[PDB]
Amino acid sequence: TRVKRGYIARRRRKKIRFFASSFRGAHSRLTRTIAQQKIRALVSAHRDRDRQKRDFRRLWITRINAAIRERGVYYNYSKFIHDLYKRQLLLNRKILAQIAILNPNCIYMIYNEIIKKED
Amino acid sequence: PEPGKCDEITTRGYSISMSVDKARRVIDQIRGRSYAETLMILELMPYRACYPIFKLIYSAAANASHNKQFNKANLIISKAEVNKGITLKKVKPRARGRSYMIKRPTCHITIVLRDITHFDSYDKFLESLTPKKLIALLGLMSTGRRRELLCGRFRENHKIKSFLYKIALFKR
Amino acid sequence: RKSTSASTKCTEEWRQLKEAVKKEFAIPHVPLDQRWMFTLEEATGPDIWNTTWYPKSADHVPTDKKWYVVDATDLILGRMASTIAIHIRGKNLASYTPSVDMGAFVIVVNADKVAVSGKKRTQKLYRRHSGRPGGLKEETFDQLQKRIPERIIEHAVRGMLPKGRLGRYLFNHLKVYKGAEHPHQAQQPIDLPLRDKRIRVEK
Amino acid sequence: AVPKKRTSIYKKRIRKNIWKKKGYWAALKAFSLAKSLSTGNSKSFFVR
Amino acid sequence: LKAEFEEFQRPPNQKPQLSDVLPDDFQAPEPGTPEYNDIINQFLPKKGPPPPREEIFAVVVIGSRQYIVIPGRWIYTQRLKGATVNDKIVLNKVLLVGTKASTYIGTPIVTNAAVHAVVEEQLLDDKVIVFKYKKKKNYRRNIGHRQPITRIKITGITGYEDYPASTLEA
Amino acid sequence: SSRPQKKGTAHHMKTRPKKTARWDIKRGPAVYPPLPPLPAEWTIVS
């Protein structure tokens, strides 16, 4: 019983092509290229869902550093954090960075608590 | 319904013996031009393509006169395009037993002539109104007359389309 | 020629209508100065508390930014250039973002009095290369400082700025003058904070 | 010498547009010429 | 009927006139009149005033992440096991309670503080494609992952008052 | 010249970074006092 491959090919291809919408040039046209390009896309995506978690911590830490350095001449990220811990506070770095931008007075308060107790 | 029904005459030449690139070179110049200017230009152009394109445009103007009743003075060439036709291949011998392929390209040309004056009533009247005045004026008439007024080229030329669907001035 | 025909009139009017309605329903901008956690309006908006804050267009606008002046006399080249780089970049603001310019402008004055340790005055070597072979050129720091002394500090700060689009666009924010006078008095420059100990040399 | 690669779509469209721009200057000459023969005052020119 | 009339008139008579669709009956309402302002209010509404909420926010720990919660708003979290739609939960890990008159800072937790929330939904997240790939080793594996998620609504932040506040008091 | 160079992994062995100083080796994570027992994450109120 002869079986033409029929549409089973072009469905697969078409469903791949849908992925590759908005790729510049021949990455949006030729199927053969599009294939590869799809894989690489999915791949980088997976990679950077992991990079992401590293990167925002990067960021947050940086912002915190800047936000504190304003107060004392000698004060750091490091010093701060150490004090947050020997004072038993749980606030993580996302929260201190967001409170740094969005409620700066708050972070000043926190610092004043940490100092008072370290005094 | 649509502006395309009111303003437009479409004319297709089929299988003109110009190759699409050559012919495109001429068609790019006449896009958007008054039918008058386009006439005289196409009479004096150096290119070969200009002659068939000319016969074509003259024809389409005649069609807008005798069929749909338009004034020739007010015709512009609104949309013009060239698409590839049926390619005839021939084989010729080269040096040392090699051959080569000659293609004798044809094309289809489509000229769409568009009256300017048609709609001018609604056109200039709606220009006459400030943006608030118009929305106050459209507060009376039923869905029917709203659709009948605003069904000119107006909404496109001033780029209101998605704004008026947001003002709840319409149904789709 | 600006056509005052009813057509262009109409279009401009309409566009200010679109802009009006888009402005009314949009969430207001609240600048960051004693900006409390939320306004009753943002509260209806997207979630800006549980995502990382990224700056919007109203923030970084060039006209706002601080200006600073560095008197470079008896400063040490590198140590000062690091400070300068920090401020130009924006790394000292809580609002810092790598992808945006949050930084300041910095004005360096007295760029011929900048000081350098040890034998560098005669040793340090500024090279630049034509792009032809044999096309290498070299100056000692001192030849340079007598000829066009601004280039020394520009060349030391540009090293510490990011490279690439944002880098260059940043580099335009560094304004350097050889005399003790700058024609920026209108911008009201603040003085630059220097927290380094070793940055000030004494003879 | 041959073409190590195949020319990309967009670059080719730019080169051919350049070749199409000569049509623009030709259309200008043609227009000016038409407006000159359209007054019947030119003694340097002749048409039949 | 004015649609059928103006369309049969733009059908039969080609080149439509303004006098036929808009008759000379309608002058439009004067730009300063109440009958003008009802329409211009209908079609171009003024922005309504914002709904009232309490001025307060908390920082609460859920599924070992910390969220900033303001009351009246819904957030996404990890699935909470054994939570049903329309459930009133209370979040007891509360690190920080801000007010624009006060801020309470726990050591670690604000004692007696409670965040009352209601679980409005149980979802599955936007499907993430996990994709394992090694070049030339002829190995690729395509695997989707949908995380279960709980969507909850904060109602109120309560029982802080007794705890010691600090302030920036200049 | 009678001496060779360091190619590939050799070179890596030579050049990789190391803390030699006895004091930096023997360092370690800070010892923080334990936390008081924390409440229940989320409770169901009926």
Next chain:
Amino acid sequence: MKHGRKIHRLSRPADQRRALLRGLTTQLLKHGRIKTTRAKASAMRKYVDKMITLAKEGSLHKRRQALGFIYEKQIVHALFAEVPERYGDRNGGYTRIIRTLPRRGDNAPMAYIELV
């Protein structure tokens, strides 16, 4: 290069270009007006004027010089009759050049050179 080389080449070698010009001027003198390419016209001016200026003097010497340029005798004699009549007062400049629509076959710029 050419600096100051003033001659019209007409894209023919010397021999042919000479013969061409002889031909074209016998045509011009025979018919009084003709249609050619702008280049051929501009080139042909000089030799037209040579013949006219030649026939203004009329000597057996001059006439022999014209006979040895133009191809057909009859035209030469006609010249040495007509010219003292028609051109007597005109000091130089005996040709008009009125340019036209370009040729269809090659788009070669055309022109009408008239005996004025």
Next chain:
RNA sequence: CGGUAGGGGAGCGUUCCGUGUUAGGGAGAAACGCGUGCGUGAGCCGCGUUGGACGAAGCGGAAGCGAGAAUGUCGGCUUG
């Protein structure tokens, strides 16, 4: 609970046959185009201002049964 050579387990789909001259279908089938739908994936389910007469699901059977590589191969169309 990394994985090549490689071995084992569990599946999806294509055309055809049984049920079956089935359910359904000019009140629009196949196909074609779309999806804020559901799957670990192969895919499924839903939708159509296309299309114009066929043909599912279930429970089973059979193969000319799945392609991106063969300086494969045949047509079509580019580049230069």
Next chain:
RNA sequence: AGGGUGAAAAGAACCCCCAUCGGGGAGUGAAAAGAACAUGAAACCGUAAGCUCUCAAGCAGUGGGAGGGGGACCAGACC
């Protein structure tokens, strides 16, 4: 190597552009399906509308997303 207009040639009278071909109307037809005629994918060639590129270095994607636009009903979302 070159198959499939329609049930039926009813294969398009007449007018217009018009040297023919080719076309636009009218008329035939359930549909124009209009003779290079049935479904009509891809490459490839364009046309229009939305955003956007002329200090820029790059297997062209991806995580972050400034500014701008679009169709919504869970308007905090999607494109």
